[PDB]
Design a protein around this ligand. Structure first.
Ligand code: CL
Ligand code: CL
Ligand code: CL
Length: 235
């Protein structure tokens, strides 16, 4: 796996500019040494492609920001669930319960069928930034990995993105994601809040929130093409 610094350096210039306050901070080198040292010590740290969400969705192309907290720490048939996009799972992995509830809301909102798989790459290529606020995890451990270092980084990301690009849609699910409103001006953006889609909270108001339809209304209001919330038949 490339060192974390090399993964920061490989980002497009537009993302590097948004992350520069963090990369210039005292927290950057320690985060890099921690993640690199965990891998060097033989721990199963996921995903390998830490910034996949950013590589697939460049800043100018961001339309919708969907926050997760930690990457999945589980696996399915020996394939890790985390692959660098919030909520998404790679081809060959069954959708976990939170993602099934996301799909249930889309199916109810638009009448689409339940997808065959859980890979959200094709939403990222349409401008859906699928950003976990903590971007690494240790296999089978629910403990957040480098929580404080990563959140300094993704806090910088959210603030700088939102300050440079007006009229984004933010889907903020759960209290942790909703607290990220402190990082931007909510009158300049569409802020959609609901409980988290996990089964523990989904029936408190995630199911029924209509966020995917609301997001598309706001995009069209601002002259942008709406998201196709379907998924192609194969991943
Ligand atoms: Cl370059
Ligand atoms: Cl700049
Ligand atoms: Cl710092």
């Amino acid at each position: 796996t490339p060192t974390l610094e090399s993964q920061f350096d490989a980002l497009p210039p537009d993302w590097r500019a948004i992350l520069e306050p963090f990369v210039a901070s005292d927290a950057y080198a320690p985060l890099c040494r921690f993640v690199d040292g965990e891998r060097a010590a033989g721990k199963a740290i996921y995903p390998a492609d830490v910034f996949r969400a950013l590589r697939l969705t460049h800043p100018d192309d961001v339309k919708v920001v969907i926050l997760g907290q930690d990457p999945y720490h589980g696996e399915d048939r020996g394939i890790p669930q985390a692959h660098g996009l919030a909520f998404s799972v790679p081809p060959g992995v069954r959708p976990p319960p939170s993602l099934r509830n996301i799909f249930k809301e889309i199916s109810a909102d638009f009448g689409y069928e339940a997808p065959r798989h859980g890979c959200l790459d094709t939403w990222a290529s349409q401008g859906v930034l699928l950003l976990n606020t903590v971007l690494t995890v240790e296999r089978s451990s629910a403990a957040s990995h480098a929580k404080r270092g990563w959140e300094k980084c993704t806090d910088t990301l959210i603030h700088e993105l939102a300050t440079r690009h007006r009229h984004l849609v933010f889907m903020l699910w759960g209290a942790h994601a909703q607290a990220k409103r402190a990082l931007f001006d909510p009158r300049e953006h569409c802020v959609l809040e609901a409980p988290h889609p996990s089964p523990l909270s989904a029936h408190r108001g995630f199911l029924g929130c209509r966020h995917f339809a609301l997001a598309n209304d706001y995009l069209v209001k601002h002259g942008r093409a709406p998201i196709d919330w379907r998924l192609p038949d194969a991943a």
